[PDB]
Symmetry: C3
Subunit: 487 residues, 3 copies
C-alpha cells in the first residue's frame, strides 16, 4: 500500500539451555558452554610431563631401593604415580613423619643417587634379610647399607663426610628395632644406646627400641627411616654404636615442578597438561569437578556438577513481531536482524555487524575465562587413609575453605557473567533498535512490539539501505510526514 512494516528481532533455537543469573536460577538461553570439566579420559597422559609409573612401588620404596623397585634407580619424573596395589615386599619399615619425607622426595623430582666412600671401618657391610629377595637370594634395600658387627665387634662409629659440592645432599638412613635381645646381640654384639646424625646446622638423635611387633612378612622387627639434608660447606657426622642402617651415598635435592599423585589410571600415549587421579583432563574449561588433587596446568576444583556459561542470549521461544514479543525460530543466518512486510512481499535478512559485535564481546569473555589455567605442581595431601588428628584436620579445613571459596567464586562469576551476557545481548538488540530509530528520524513510528511502522513507500532497495546504514531520511521525509500527520 503506502506504508511498510520493518520489524527488528533476533534468532531463537527450538531447544535452549537453562542457565543461572542474578535475577533467576532457571533462564533459557539459545546456547551455553560447560565451564566445569566433569569427565576424564580415564588414562594419565605421559606428555609434556615425565610420568614415572610406580607399578608395585611407592615412592619411599623406590627411594630405599627394595628389590621390586630396582627399575626405579636414578630415575627422574615430573609426576610420580603411586598405585593403591603397591605393597612393600622387603624388610618391614616405618617412617616417622612419613608424609614429610614423601613430600620432600616428590618435590625433589629425582632418585639420582651418588655412592660415597664412607669409612665404615670395623663393621660388616651389606647385611641381608630373607624378606628382601633380589634375584632368588637374600638381599636388602639397595640404597641402604645394613651394618652389623665384624668379628663379633661393633666399634663406636664417628664417620664424617664434608659437602664440597654446590648442592644440598639428602641422606636417607634408619634405625633397626629388633624383635628381641637375641637379635640385638646376634647382629650388633652389644646392647645399644642412641644413634646421632648431625651437621653444623642441626642434629637428630634417635634410640633403638628392642621389642616384639606384629609380624609383617614373618619379620617381628622394624626399620625406622630418618633423613638429613647437608648444605654446601656443611659436614655430615654419623655417631653410632649399633642399629645403624647407613646411607650408601646421597640423593640430589632439587627445586622444580615435581610432585606425587595416587592413581589407578593406566598411562597412555597423549599430550595433556592436567593430570588428576581419574586420569588426565582437558584444561580448556576454567573449572573442574573430577578431583581435588591436580598436577600441571589444571582448572580449579569446584563442587558444582555443572556451571553453564551463556555463550548466547535468552531464547524467548516462538502479521510479524519484533524482539519485544518473541524471538525468531526461522532465523539461521545471524543472531540479530530485520524482517519486513512490504507491498513487494514479506522478507528477512540478518544484521551481521550487531551479531559479530555480540559474538566479539562473548569471545572476549571466553578469552578471559577459557585458556587461563592454574599451573600447580606440589600441593598438600587431600585424601587420607589414617586418622592422626590436628594436622589432618587443619589440612582438610584449608582444602575445604579453598573449595568453598572457589565454588563461591565460580557461582558468583557464572551468575554475574550470565546476567552480563543477557544484558549485553539485549543491549545490542537495543543499539540496533535505537540506531534504526535514529536513522529513520520522523519517517517511522515505534509500534511497541519491536517493530517500526514506516509511513512511506519503502521498497526492497529502501529496506536494504536501512539495514546497511545508508538510508537517507530526507528523500522520504515529506511522504512519511504527510502519512503520519493528516496534512
Amino acid at each position: 500500500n503506502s506504508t511498510a512494516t520493518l520489524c527488528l528481532g533476533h534468532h531463537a533455537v527450538p531447544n535452549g539451555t537453562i542457565v543461572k543469573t542474578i535475577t533467576n536460577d532457571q533462564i533459557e538461553v539459545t546456547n551455553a558452554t560447560e565451564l566445569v570439566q566433569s569427565s576424564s579420559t580415564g588414562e594419565i597422559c605421559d606428555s609434556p610431563h615425565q610420568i614415572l609409573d610406580g607399578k608395585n612401588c611407592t615412592l619411599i620404596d623406590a627411594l630405599l631401593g627394595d628389590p621390586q623397585c630396582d627399575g626405579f634407580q636414578n630415575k627422574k619424573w615430573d609426576l610420580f604415580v603411586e598405585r593403591s596395589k603397591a605393597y612393600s615386599n622387603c624388610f618391614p619399615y616405618d617412617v616417622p613423619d612419613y608424609a614429610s619425607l614423601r613430600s620432600l622426595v616428590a618435590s625433589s623430582g629425582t632418585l639420582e643417587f651418588n655412592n660415597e666412600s664412607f669409612n665404615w671401618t670395623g663393621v660388616t657391610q651389606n647385611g641381608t634379610s630373607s624378606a628382601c629377595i633380589r634375584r632368588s637370594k637374600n638381599s636388602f634395600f639397595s640404597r641402604l647399607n645394613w651394618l652389623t658387627h665384624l668379628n663379633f665387634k661393633y666399634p663406636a662409629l664417628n664417620v664424617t663426610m664434608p659437602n664440597n659440592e654446590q648442592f644440598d645432599k639428602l641422606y636417607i638412613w634408619g634405625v633397626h628395632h629388633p624383635g628381641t635381645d637375641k637379635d640385638q646381640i646376634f647382629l650388633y654384639a652389644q646392647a645399644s644406646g642412641r644413634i646421632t646424625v648431625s651437621t653444623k646446622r642441626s642434629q637428630q638423635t634417635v634410640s633403638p627400641n628392642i621389642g616384639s611387633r606384629p609380624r609383617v612378612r614373618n619379620i617381628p622387627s622394624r626399620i625406622s627411616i630418618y633423613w638429613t639434608i647437608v648444605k654446601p660447606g656443611d659436614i655430615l657426622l654419623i655417631n653410632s654404636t649399633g642399629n645403624l642402617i647407613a646411607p650408601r651415598g646421597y640423593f640430589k635435592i632439587r627445586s622444580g615442578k615435581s610432585s606425587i599423585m595416587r592413581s589407578d589410571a593406566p598411562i597412555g600415549k597423549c599430550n595433556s597438561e592436567c593430570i588428576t587421579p581419574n586420569g588426565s583432563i582437558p584444561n580448556d574449561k576454567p573449572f573442574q569437578n573430577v578431583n581435588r588433587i591436580t598436577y600441571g596446568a589444571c582448572p580449579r576444583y569446584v563442587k558444582q556438577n555443572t556451571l553453564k556459561l551463556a555463550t548466547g542470549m535468552r531464547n524467548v521461544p516462538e502479521a510479524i513481531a519484533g524482539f519485544i514479543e518473541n524471538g525468531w525460530e526461522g532465523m539461521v543466518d545471524g543472531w540479530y536482524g530485520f524482517r519486513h512486510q512490504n507491498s513487494e512481499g514479506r522478507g528477512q535478512a540478518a544484521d551481521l555487524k550487531s551479531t559479530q559485535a555480540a559474538i566479539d564481546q562473548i569471545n572476549g569473555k571466553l578469552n578471559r575465562l577459557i585458556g587461563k589455567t592454574n599451573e600447580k605442581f606440589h600441593q598438600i595431601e587431600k585424601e587420607f587413609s589414617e586418622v592422626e588428628g590436628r594436622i589432618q584436620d587443619l589440612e582438610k579445613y584449608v582444602e575445604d575453605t579453598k573449595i568453598d571459596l572457589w565454588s563461591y567464586n565460580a557461582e558468583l562469576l557464572v551468575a554475574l557473567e550470565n546476567q552480563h551476557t543477557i544484558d549485553l545481548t539485549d543491549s545490542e538488540m537495543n543499539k540496533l533498535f535505537e540506531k534504526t530509530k535514529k536513522q529513520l528520524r520522523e519517517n517511522a513510528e515505534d509500534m511497541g512490539n519491536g517493530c517500526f511502522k514506516i509511513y512511506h513507500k519503502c521498497d526492497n532497495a529502501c529496506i536494504g539501505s536501512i539495514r546497511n546504514g545508508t538510508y537517507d531520511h530526507d528523500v522520504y521525509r515529506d511522504e512519511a510526514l504527510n502519512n503520519r500527520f493528516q496534512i
Copy 2:
C-alpha cells in the same frame, strides 16, 4: 480541560533504611533486610542435633571415665558441649597431643566401649587412687586399668588383640609418671621401663620419667595418655615392663558429623539447625557475627556487624510529580503506579504487574541468599587459651584468612546486590514509563518530571485502559495531534 496529565512514579516511606552500593556508601532505600545474624537466643537448642551436655566433664574426662562422667558412658552425640566450669577430680593427666585426641574423638561421635578380655597375667588389676573417688571408695578411671605388681613382681607383658571386625578400634592407654623412685619400686618393683604399643602399620614407644611435679589435687605424679588406632585386619600388640595404664577395651571410630564445642550456654527445649557457643541462632540469614565457631547448617562468619540488603527501591521522599523528582508517600497499594489529573479530578492507582515483577526479582534474589546455608560439622580450633607457637599461628592465620575473604565476599555481594536492586527497580520504573510512552504513541509528550502530558480529553476511562494496557491510540490520535501540532 482539553488535555490531561498522567504522572508515573513509585512509593516512598517516611523512614527508610541506609544501605551500601557500588558508588554510594549511604544510599537510602524504602526497605531492607538484615543479612547478618548478630544476636542469639542465649540457649542451645537440643533439636534436631543430638547434644550431650558436658556438665562438669570435659570430653577427654568423659573418654577416660572420670567419676563425674558416669552419665557419659557408651553415649552418642552430634555435638558435645564442653563447659568452662568443667574440671577433673581424678588422677591428673597430660595428653601430649591433647587437641588431636579431643578432635579425633569429637569427630568419632561416641563413647561406645567394649570390655575386651585383655590377658593381663602376673600383675594386679584395678589399681585405685585417693584422688579419684567413686561412692566414697578409692577408684580410678573406668576405661583405664592401672596395673601394678603381683607378689612384688611385674613380668614383661606381651598382650595381643587382633582386629577381626570390619571397623577401626581406638585403644586409649597411658604411662604413669610417679613423683619419685620409691613410688615406682612400691608399685612396680622395677627401677624403670619402656612401653611399646605396636600395630602392623605403626608403633608408639614411651618411657616413664621419674620426678616431682606440682601437686594437683595433692598428687605429685602424672598419667600420660596415648592412643592407638587399629585398622580391620590389623593387630594390637602391647609390650610393657612397668608403668602401664592399660586399656580395658576399645572405643569405636566412626566417620560422621560429630564435633566438640566450648560453651557455657544452657540447653533447653527448642529447634535450631545452627549451634553457636553463645546459644543457637536462626540460620535464615546468609551471614552471622555471633561467634567464629559454628556447628551444623550455619551461615558464614563475617567481621561486619551489619549488612543490609535492599528489598525495595531508593527512597526519595517529598502539581503532580513523578519518579524523576520524588517518591510518593501516598502510594500504599503497590510499589509502582500512576497519578493523574483530568477534568473529573485528581487520582492515584497502583500498577500491580510492575510491582509484582520487581517483587518476584527480589524474592528470587532472597531465595539465592536467604535460606541457603553451609553444613559445617568438624573444624579446626578457633579459640586458644595456651600459647603453642607455629601450629596455633597457622590455625589463626587460616581462620583469619577465611574470615577476611568471606568478609570481602559479603561486602562485595551486598554492594553488588544493592546496586542491582536499585538498577532493577529503576529499570522497572523506566520500563513502565517506556511502555506508557509506547501505548500513547503520538498522543502524549514527556514533561521531564516523570509525567506525560496527554493532549486529548482523557477522563477516567482512557486512564483505566492505560493502566491496564491495550490502550487504543488511534481513536484519540487526531485530537491529540491537533492539540500538539497546531499553532
Copy 3:
C-alpha cells in the same frame, strides 16, 4: 540559517591508558590510577612502629643474651628486623622448634627480663665459654646460668619457682650436649641423666645426648634450647641431675601487635604504616606487589605487576561529531560539555554538573578502594631457608591459596569497577543527552551522532539557557514546529 546545531560530547586526551574490563582487556581510557604498589622506598621507616634493628643479632640470640646482643636487653619492639648478615658469636645452640620460640618471642614484643632468686644450691653458677667473648673475657649467654658442679658434686636440683603475679612467665632454659664423656664428667661430675621441667598443667622431659658433632666456632658440643610458660597461680619445678643450662629469671609474655621480619633494608627517619622486607611502602593503594611478608596497615599482596583502575571515560580519539562518533580532544574545562553552531558562530563550553556527578561517583569508588587497607601484625612464615616437610608445604599452600584468591578478587574487582566506570560515564553522557532532549521537547531532533538539530533561531543566550536548564520550549515552539514539519 533558520536552524542551529547543538552537539553534546565529552573530553579526550592525545594519549590514554589501557585498562581491563569484563568483555575487553585492552580498552583505552582518558585516565587511570595504579592500584598495585610495585616499588618501595628502600628503607624501613622507624615511625609510627617501634623498630629494633637486629644488626648482627637474631631474635633468639637477643633472647638468650649473646655477647653481641647486649644492646637488646630489656628492649621492646613493634617489629623486630632480622638481618641476613646476622650470625652467632657464642656457644653453638639448636632450638628443636625454632619457629615456635621465635614466634612466641616476636609476638610477646619485649625482652623485659626479671631476675629471680633461684635456689641453685650445691652447684657452681656462671659457667663460661671461649666462644662467648663479652669484655675480652670468657662468658656465656647473659640470660642463662650454666650450672656445672660444686666441689665435684652435683646434687639433684629440685628447684621450685612459684608464679604469684597476674601474668604468664616465659622461662628459657637448655640442655648441654657435650662432645665427649670426658666433658660430661669435667662439667657435671656424673654421666647421663635427664632434665624435667614441669608445671601443674604440663611437663617436659629431655635427655642429654653425649657425642661428637661438627665443630662450630671450634666447639663440638651443642646447647638445646627449651622453654615453658607458667600461668598465674602455678609453680615451676626444675628437676635436674646434670647438663642444665638454667634460667636466670623470666621473660614477660604480652598479647599485642609485635612480630618479626627478615630484611636487609636500612632503617630510615620517616613515617610509614606498612613495612615490607624491601622497606616501607605507601599504604594508599588497595594492593601491592612488593612482598608477601607484611607488617602494619598494609595493602593485600597480589600476583599482578599492575592493575589500573579507570578514573575516567573511554578515550575515543579523533562538522561537529558528538559523543557517538568520537570524543573532543579540545575540551579542557570539563569531562562533559556542549559544542554548537548558530547564526553568530561556533563555540564550546563544559557542563560542570554532569562532570561533577561523574567525578563524585568515581571518588566514591576511590574512597571504597583507596585508603582502606588491612592491618596485620603477626602472620605465618612465607619464605624458608630450608625444606622441612608437610608443615612447610601447608604454610606455603595456605599463603599461595590466599594470594591466588586475593589475586582473583583483585582482577574481578578491577574488571568490574572498570566496566562499571565505563558504564557510569556512558550513562552520565546518556542522562545529559536525554535531559537536553527533554528540555528541547519537539523543538529539536536527534540526528544520530550525539547532536541535536534545533529548528528555531537559537543564539548564544539560547544555547546558554539550554546548558543550565532554563530553556523554555514554549516560546520557541511555533518556529521550531514550522521548520521541523513542513
